Design a protein around this nucleic acid. Structure first.
Lengths: 22, 95, 145
RNA sequence: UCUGGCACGGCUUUUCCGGAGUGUAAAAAGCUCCGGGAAUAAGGGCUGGGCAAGGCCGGUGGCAGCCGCCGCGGUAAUACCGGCG
RNA sequence: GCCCGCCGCCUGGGGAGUACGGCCGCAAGGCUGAAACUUAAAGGAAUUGGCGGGGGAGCACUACAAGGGGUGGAGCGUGCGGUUU
RNA sequence: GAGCCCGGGCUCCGUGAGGGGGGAGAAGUCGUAACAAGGUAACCGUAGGGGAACCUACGGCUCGAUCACCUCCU
RNA sequence: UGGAGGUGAUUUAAAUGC
């Protein structure tokens, strides 16, 4: 679980933060 | 003697196109429309329907052209009987 | 020391504590801001008239299936799209499209649609300023336009 | 049908009609006095558990509906609709 | 435990430790931190039972070893699956 | 000394292609992740990698594993 | 009589069910 979520949250964050940074 | 249910009122013959999940099926009907159909529970427990089965459909009283409930499923020999009485056409079943 | 300062002059700490910790009641926070009043259209009100855009029927929930009678109505000043649950058996009949339909809530404003219905926040009382429970009984009055 | 109900016999008579002043400082309010005078406006909700405070018949059949929650309707439903209680 | 003093934090679940804003950080990130919506649960301890590709003890002869015989090879008898009618 | 106007800046209301997530529907598909040591114990912070559940490294923790082996304690 | 460590560990036993 919290492994999952942390990396899902991180990937969401990055990918989206990539989309914001871009 | 063989006896086969037939569509009563505004009920329609249909062929099951796609399984959506959760007792909802897309059904191609005999008037030419695809209805999103519900399987009443009283039915789901009694039978195992599948893609490319022929059914009776009861359209809903609102959005008659888009939704219905499947109300009876036909076995393979009933489907043959409905082909031989001219109730359904072989061209309708295949699609 | 079970929490709190106790001491003559301290009280202010008390006084701010409570308030700080009050805002963990969703309900309290919400009213004191007025989120109850802003979001779930009405502008807060008891009821709202609106023009019946169309009639739609939706599915029931998890152990259940049955066609509930729901309208789509547009509140007039609110100017917001509301889908809605209609009391009574026959009813959907007595409601013509483009009659006025007064609308209320149903069963705690919290958001809670009743157990069966997914969405429906609201209730309908009226068709052309005469209600639905009056139109379930044949004698009392019967509809127009 | 003894919670109560009905016949029948007797009593009284809220509203309602008419009169006196009133009040008006003009009415109305018609009250209040007196004469006439009828047993003559009652309903709404609920009755599964919660809450019980309250249960049968007939229809219907996980439908149509009920629903504040917990649930109830999948062919003997006390929970839905109607009736009866 | 029972008292006395202060401090941090909590106020059902999920949404979400996310969005936005600000602050910090080279970067990776951190600190702070909602709402719309949705649900009659989320949860904790212990009890029982069933279960585990867990451990000990003990039996069995529908068990296995040990052992004697045999089925499965053929012909026939029989009952069946199927096919035929 | 008002309203009025003009040019620019900032903010807020009605409304928009497109885009994000939630609680769901539970008849399609992939896998077996966890819950029994779940059949490689599990979780945990951090880092990389994988379609997915997830795997691996390093450090921690037992809310940790079943005998066995060794060590202590009323 | 009941509790805590340190390390052998065992692959001969296979995904799913409204």
């Amino acid at each position: 679980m919290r492994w999952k979520w942390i990396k899902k949250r991180i990937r969401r964050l990055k990918r989206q933060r990539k989309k914001e940074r871009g | 003697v063989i006896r086969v249910p037939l569509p009563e009122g505004n009920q329609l013959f249909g062929v099951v196109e796609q399984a959506l999940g959760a007792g909802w099926m897309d059904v191609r009907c005999e008037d030419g429309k695809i209805r999103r159909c519900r399987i009443p529970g009283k039915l789901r427990r009694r039978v195992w329907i599948r893609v490319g089965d022929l059914v009776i459909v009861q359209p809903w009283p609102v959005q008659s052209d888009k939704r219905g409930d499947i109300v009876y499923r036909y076995t393979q020999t009933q489907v043959d009987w409905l082909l031989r009485k001219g109730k359904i056409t072989q061209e309708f079943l295949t699609g | 020391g079970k929490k709190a300062p106790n001491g003559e002059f301290a009280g202010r700490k008390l006084k701010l504590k409570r308030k700080k910790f009050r805002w963990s009641d969703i309900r309290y926070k919400r009213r004191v801001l007025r989120l109850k009043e802003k979001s779930d259209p009405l502008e807060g009100a008891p009821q709202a008239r609106g023009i019946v855009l169309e009639k739609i029927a939706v599915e029931a929930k998890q152990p259940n299936s049955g066609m509930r009678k729901a309208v789509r109505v547009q509140l007039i000043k609110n100017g917001k799209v509301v889908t809605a649950f209609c009391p009574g058996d026959g009813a959907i009949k007595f409601i013509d499209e483009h009659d006025e339909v007064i609308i209320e809530g149903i069963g705690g404003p919290k958001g809670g649609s009743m157990g069966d219905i997914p969405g429906i926040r609201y209730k309908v009382v009226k068709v052309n300023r005469v209600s639905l429970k009056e139109l379930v009984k044949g004698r009392k009055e019967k509809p127009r336009r």
